[PDB]
Amino acid sequence: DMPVERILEAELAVDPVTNICQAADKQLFTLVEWAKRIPHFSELPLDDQVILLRAGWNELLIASFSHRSIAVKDGILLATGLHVHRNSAHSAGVGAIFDRVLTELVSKMRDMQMDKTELGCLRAIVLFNPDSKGLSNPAEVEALREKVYASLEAYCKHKYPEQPGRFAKLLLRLPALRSIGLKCLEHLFFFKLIGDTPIDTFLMEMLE
Amino acid sequence: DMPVERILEAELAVDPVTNICQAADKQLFTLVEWAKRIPHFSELPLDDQVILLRAGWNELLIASFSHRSIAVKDGILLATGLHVHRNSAHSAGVGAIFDRVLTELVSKMRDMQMDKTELGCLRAIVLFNPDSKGLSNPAEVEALREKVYASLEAYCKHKYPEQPGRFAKLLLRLPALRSIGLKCLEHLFFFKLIGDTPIDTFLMEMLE
Amino acid sequence: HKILHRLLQDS
Amino acid sequence: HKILHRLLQDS
Ligand SMILES: CC(C)c1cccc(-c2cc(/C=C/C(=O)O)ccc2O)c1
Ligand SMILES: CC(C)c1cccc(-c2cc(/C=C/C(=O)O)ccc2O)c1
């Protein structure tokens, strides 16, 4: 129904502010292909697929670059292969949120060795966000979310039975992800306001 | 170790912008007494108790007024007994976040009949926030959080065994609570900026 | 939202 | 944070 193997397959299948904006734009195209590979997403009404991706893209990308950065020392590995370290983050004005990414997401993913199936399932939970405004039938989206976390729980309890609290521990990174996403979006809106975003991009559409 | 009965006991034991500010201030005093009744909170270093309550008070109060408002029609029951309905919310400039409270918290609490033990446990999870900056030992706070949600899960699985997903469903209101809290805090900072907050209050200290 | 709505239909 | 630090010690 919502097999974690399919969610894993979807994961495996896919100036510092210029670098940040170019990386986010690159990954937006990839994110659409990722979402189509999540079971039942493409069966939602098209206008609801649009709503979910507009509501969730930023958290979905942040989760992915955070997990990608586990092997980086005190930094973020952007999808372009460029790193953001502390000096660049401060030059971009994003030093405080950079620190939160490292302490609340990257380091916690690293400490618990969050795996790619778990990451993919948390991202599918964020994708299937039933609070997204304007959905034709929010409960259908909640139903898909509940299928994801039922599958995630069964996966964690089979693979990590000596860690009974692991499923809840994964879900309890999502408030941090929500906060962090709101602040990153604030920064991106500011980069757009002052004209530091590349123009004519998919990122600009997401910010409009 | 972290008995839900004790968390329940803690729950049971305790111009529109003027009304909103007076209600929040009233409940701040009560919230300190609530936190002292949560197992092991008062055993943390005092400076860490200060940090947790400064980090969490706003979400803790929002969770409580949301659950209190289940029996209100399209409105919020403030702790003073005054109601906020849609017209007042718009006069205060808080119509959009009012709508989010009703759709993302009150109505969802009502639909699932979230009970007071569940509410108290979600509030204790928010209280024991290990991401709060400056904690002397963040992992001790994570340890207490994990004791709360282990107890919450066992309570839900005993009382509501026909709802296997209920525990995760409770935890997955916390990203909404985080967002909503950030926006309510923004409004309160604005009320303070323009001089619409009562002065000399505990609320003003929380906002300073 | 022309880019996203097109990419969702592009196979 | 004088109010909160006092109330936490007040029994
Ligand atoms: C943490 C800091 C570097 C910061 C600041 C503002 C925005 C962002 C931000 C970056 C990306 C990059 C995705 C990638 O390379 O895979 C996606 C979304 C984003 O919000 C980050
Ligand atoms: C939802 C809207 C009415 C809005 C706007 C801004 C602030 C708040 C706000 C209100 C309280 C009230 C608590 C009570 O009566 O128990 C506590 C914290 C708060 O953030 C609400």
What attributes does this structure have?
heterotetramer, A: 208 residues, mainly alpha, Retinoid X Receptor, two-stranded antiparallel sheet, 10 helices, C: 11 residues, 1 helix, 73% helix, elongated, binds the ligand CC(C)c1cccc(-c2cc(/C=C/C(=O)O)ccc2O)c1, Retinoic acid receptor RXR-alpha (chains A, B)
Order of helices and strands of chain A: HHHEEHHHHHHH
Number of helical segments with 4 or more residues of chain A? 10
CATH architecture of chain A: Orthogonal Bundle
**Share in β-strands of chain A:** under 5%
Instruction: Characterize the largest beta sheet of chain A: strand count, sense, and whether it forms a barrel.
Output: 2 strands, antiparallel
| Number of helical stretches of at least 4 residues of chain C | 1
Cα Rg of chain A: 17 Å
Helix percent of chain A reads 55-70%
Cα-atom Rg of chain C, whole angstroms?
Answer: 6 Å
Query: Between the first and last Cα atoms of chain A, what is the distance in angstroms?
Result: 35 Å
SS strand fraction of chain C: under 5%
Biggest sheet strand line-up of chain A: 1-2
SS content category of chain C: mainly alpha
Task: Please name the two chains that share the biggest interface, counting residues whose Cβ lies under 8 Å from a Cβ on the partner chain.
Answer: A-B, 24 and 24 residues
CATH C-level label of chain A = Mainly Alpha
What is the distance, rounded to the nearest whole angstrom, between the alpha carbons of the first and last residues of chain C?
A: 18 Å
Structural class of chain A: mainly alpha
Q: Which compounds are bound in this model?
A: ligand J57
Largest sheet of chain C: none
Count of separate structural domains of chain A: 1
Assembly form of the protein: heterotetramer
Protein name (chains A, B): Retinoic acid receptor RXR-alpha
Region (Required for nuclear export) (chains A, B): 100-120
Domain NR LBD (chains A, B): 1-208
Subcellular location (chains A, B): Nucleus; Cytoplasm; Mitochondrion
